[model samples]
Target chain A: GMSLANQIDQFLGTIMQFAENKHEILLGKAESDVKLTSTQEAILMLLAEQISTNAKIAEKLKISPAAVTKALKKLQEQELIKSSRATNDERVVLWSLTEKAVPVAKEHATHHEKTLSTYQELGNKFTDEEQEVISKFLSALTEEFQ
Target chain B: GMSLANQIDQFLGTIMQFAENKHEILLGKAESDVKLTSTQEAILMLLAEQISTNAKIAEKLKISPAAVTKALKKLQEQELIKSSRATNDERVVLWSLTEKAVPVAKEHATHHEKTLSTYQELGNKFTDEEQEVISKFLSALTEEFQ
Candidate 1:
């Protein structure tokens, strides 16, 4: 059935969303949209969590300094973040999520909160027999790849 | 049950590999070497699949022409592909996979063929009633995130 394939494809897509938004899911993040790779998302999450100098983020993420610079550049272009230096210090600058970004993060957090509670409800939503079938499907599908 | 979550979690973990290798899984495509973003992979796939002039590739992938140029340079750095111009055509050049690239593409394609087959095989594993369980559950779960 076309619907069967769609279900599988759609279900498989959920894994990618889960993988990409693991932080959003875990943190109870909200509804918002920003195009980001993992490094950018880490920066976004940590800024919302904010003194993360570029070097510090690179060190934490273990990406190259140049790569972080480029990532920072893209985020800046989107106006989602800003950088500043301490008044008394010349060592380096610090990053902060920008004014435009507050709602982005807030909405992202709220959306994830809903997702987590929904995930918790999964066990209660289906029959024990249905769960067994799910387990069967996941287990069977998983093995085929290995 | 924890068993179900464990099954889902394990399956979730199992899937990063799948998404990362979607090209291979879809095309019947590399664990060989050289990390590539989608653009580079498109270039690689097209070159192996050759004549994909850089311009042709950009047109095909809908990337900015400059981005494709950069991708070509990276593939050249990795020695996975090469470009050439026709003696008569002065507008631009064409691309082809290199000797080293044959195994990479071959390996990727083989994996894709198998993975799609696995999807097909799994598609048949459940009865129609069982599919209702799978369909409704996957739809509701994925729908929440949307």
Candidate 2:
């Protein structure tokens, strides 16, 4: 029993290592002369989804407005993102990716889809009942952590 | 087939969310008037495992020495960890957890054990062959990321 538990722990550890590797790959592939941190890349991905103001980005990212401002300033300096005064209010600055960031955004999206496909391929290896057992285990473990 | 893939992605996403939650809890519980970042807490966890020099810590964490120095400074300021010149080599600084950090370290270890047991219980819910299939699927997905 202890051995089985240890194996599960090792499994989870490897899963996190894989996730970290993917994060590093995304950071490396992002188009920035100054290397982007994962947080900055995450911001770019958010902007790719929808143009939002600093406040909105801060809210969505669960960071402080000051933190968002600092990151946005660095992204702006790198020319990956640009900001404009909101039409109704000059004080509110809206942010969006520059044309330079388009390819990077596309790469991020493509990598995500590719990753999903990999999971799908893995899923195909299991029967429906087997998949259900795995899913239930994950759901229980996830719920316990919460 | 696509649905199975979607389920797997959702499971992985929840795992990460659970991890982030645990990190936040550790940061909040660390015995410090000064707040510790998750990165700083991670360094402490490594030190709890073994006494390490700054270079070793940086290598293991995959962070720059400068970054390690910064986090160590914060951790030291919080009294969670301490450093000293190694006896064998005056130029090298070795790190270890402070007495105050012991409880936090134990709590971290206990949480890990509890998580493992959760997985063990989940394993009991499955047939032997089903468990093998889930393990195989996870192992295959993990290898694909490499």
Candidate 3:
């Protein structure tokens, strides 16, 4: 058995590295020209997933309506997204990817696909029982943080 | 064998949850009174860990020097940190936790301890073989992102 300290040390190391990679995937954030902040990028992906409206996006993203509003305005100005009032409810806004943003959404989707494939490639290495252990371990790790 | 799609789905779910909990722990930061922002809080904890100096803190936190300077100023004014110049290099600023910040640092530390304990608890439940799988899996997942 590995010493308790060794396991804990490894866990801690990977945790920090994990967070670092998450941030490092996107850098320096929008400033000089038209660019997507992480939030705006998320909105694009969600709209492509067919999720529309401010409240729904905010709920899914766990951000506020105000944040969604600000992001939608930026996305609109960037010509990445267009909003239309719901026919059934004028007050309800529906968001969709603009033609120009179709490629942008696909690019974002490709990033996710690549990440998903990592899980697949890793999973492919394991049998059913080992796969069970991983999915269980991931849930346990996630629940602790939650 | 568990289907590939199912494994990928669980990984995707846990990934989003991991990021959510990370943000949810600290909310609506630095609005009223003398509350420390997450940046300021990290500095206090880092100093407590004996990693003194803005450049070190900036490097450790992966933020800019300007960010560390701003957080240090806030922490200093809040009486959480005190700074002094290095004897060898007048330009080198050293940071230390104030008496008042000792408890704050400990509190932040306790949060980390609890998280670490979750790993230990989960690790303790698994056999050495399974622990190897999990650790290897975490490393692989982290590297893919990196």
Candidate 4:
């Protein structure tokens, strides 16, 4: 019963909300709203955590420089981030979240935790016996990928 | 471990057998083959639900009309959806799911459920108490700004 989506439209909408405001404050800075892909999100999270050059990010994320450039173009246009050439090396481009983006990053981190907490609470409706069955099922599924 | 996603590619591939040849199946569209940004997923999900104009969707999704337009254009080129001016309002372009898109949408919905269900069945890995905690946390965080 739990496998069936409780409400698809609502669920999608909620999930979408999580994506749409990734840089919550930056949502207002750009002429248009921007959403990030998971790969993009991971990239930004890395940059937001610490200023880094594209080569560093590409290496860490295990993707090509071309992919990194593609993702950066989209974010830059939104003004969520900016790049400055490194004085030490012209070839290096340092990326950092914009000032307007700091709040958004903090919000995103908070929101991530909140989403996880909600699901955990929903799991409590079942008996301990039922919970065991469900957990076993869930563990096998998530573990299968690894 | 069930390794739900490990089974997904195979499962959905097999699902075709159970579905009507002409049934509204959702998966394997070109865009589906590629990864999506969260925002792109939102536009796809919205389009899959029904053809919608940019303005209405923006209003409902609470993002800027510009953001919707940007994402829509990308989605169109990807072939997951089609867009055209609404007969009633030339400025209001209506978006629709393409023949190839239904399967893509269904696949996303399918994988999403499998992931979550796996989490739920896993037991203390995720608990109802934890979900409640998360739900409240998310609500407070998102609502804090609003």
Candidate 5:
């Protein structure tokens, strides 16, 4: 086996072709629930994932607290989330999805799963050698996503 | 009639349902353009909206000056935008969408409209109650988009 980076690159490339098409479809599906500005939606997703604390979510997503705050404030106004200090510590304003947000979150997760399946299905069409090249490229790409 | 908030909610809900499909189509159509990383396209959209000042954009988007500078440099390199400084205030560097970017933005907007239309056309095939639920649900989702 190649390096970890090489493996992810191969995986991501093989997947992107399929992801691209399915991304379009799912984006269509999600539009009703998430016609949010791109950044706002990204923040909603991170929050919906229970990436509660702003610091960790920002770090993982490579965004800033201020950016997250702006989007979160808007989501708050929409009644999709509520933030509060952790009982254990006042400094921890943990974010969580509201009941209203469950359906949207479920839809988002389903969309992601559909995209994954799309790639697997398409990869079936390729010859072994082509799959190898694509696998290596997508593996590298997947590593980048991580 | 119930309250200002209620009316706003209803109005926004209708718009949300309309834009939901619109947004999906917008993003779907822009799959090729979206090949740029999420951060990169954020910069493009800011420029397109005439949010041109680097410091203002950085602060608004909650990104560092350096990161925005680097992204803007990439956009200029790609000819998606052009930059110049204010004569009275050289510290303020302004950006504007290039001719090429105009179509990109319009198409992006159009994608959302078309996507919404498609969903509407499909939902028309469903029972009225099911369609109503989807519409109400979509309205709630749209509020979160802001």
Candidate 6:
């Protein structure tokens, strides 16, 4: 194994790669009708899973409510998402992806699933005990930052 | 041990946490005199390490050269960095952090060192064999993305 310093460097390097590629990864699968930023694509993906109020979207994405409103307005204008009154609560507005957005959502989801599979394949390269160590290490790092 | 699915999810989750907190972490240490966006702060950190041409900065940051130029222009307006002709290569324009940027650079570097130390602590929790497995997995995942 490499020294702790080297490992730390590698970890940061990997993060940088993720940060740099995130824009491309999210937008790559989008159909040519409209362009999407990473944030916009994320909101669409969340809507694909469940109809959500603006506040819920903001909270889940950790963005400001105002940003959610702006993005929602744009997504609506693009006809990728539409708003409707909650069936159980008329006062609440829920956002759902339009039928037009289904293919885009599915495309991004496929990419995500493929990425997870790649990681799983990497995990399978190690023994159970080794996997346990990696898990523990990641958990500790997460807690350290928290 | 959990299924590979859970481990893959955890890995991605931790990286997301890191990405989300980065802006707060960097800005928390910055003095009130000036505020910088994550990209702007990144340029400062890169300049702190070495004098770089705009193309070099763009290449290292995985951003477009035009973006480097724009960020550099803003940084210069803030007087945090200055452009200079290279001593040996008059045709080359190098960017270097100004005296005003020293504390900002130092603050960012300190945070970076602290983050690396946290990662090192995580590494210490694992045995040599475990560490090797973890390293291999990370390297493989990074290569997968490439």
lDDT, candidate 6, A1-146, per-residue tens:
26765665665555655655343332123333445766787899899999899999999999998889888988899999999998898899988999979887887678667656766777777888877777776666556544
lDDT of 4 by residue, A28-125 (tens): 22332346765677777787899898889889989999999998888788787899998898987899999987777666655554544444454455
The DockQ of each candidate is 0.21, 0.25, 0.17, 0.05, 0.02, 0.25
In the range B65-115, model 3's lDDT, one tens digit per residue, is 999999998888888889889989999889998887788777656755665
Stretches off by above 4 angstroms in model 1 are A1-27, A30-116, A120-133, A144-146, B2-10, B13-31, B127-146
lDDT, candidate 1, B27-82, per-residue tens:
22345344676678778888877667766787888889889989899988889888
lDDT of 1 by residue, A42-137 (tens): 688778876588778988888999889888888888999998986678877889899888788777756645544556577468898988887888
Candidate 2 positional error at B146, Å: 3.7
Residues B1-146, model 4: lDDT tens digits: 13322232232223323222321223223233556676778778877787888888898678998898888888889888887888986777788988988898987777655645544444345456644443343343334233
lDDT of each: 0.70, 0.71, 0.68, 0.59, 0.57, 0.73
- TM-scores of all predicted structures: 0.51, 0.50, 0.51, 0.38, 0.37, 0.55
Q: Give candidate 5 regions above 4 Å deviation.
A: A1-32, A132-146, B1-146
For model 6, what TM-score is found for chain B?
Answer: 0.61
Query: Global CA lDDT of candidate 6, please?
Result: 0.73
- Tens digit of per-residue lDDT, candidate 6, span B37-125: 66788899889999999889989999998788889989999999999998998999999999979887886678667656766777777
Give candidate 6's TM-score: 0.55
User: Order the candidates by TM-score, highest first — what do you get?
Assistant: 6, 1, 3, 2, 4, 5
Off by over 4 Å in 2: A1-6, A16-43, A49-74, A85-94, A144-146, B1-7, B10-116
After superposing candidate 6, which stretches have Cα over 4 Å from the reference? A21-98, B20-105
Interface RMSD list for the candidates? 3.3, 3.8, 5.1, 11.7, 20.6, 3.6
Better of 4 and 6 by TM-score: 6
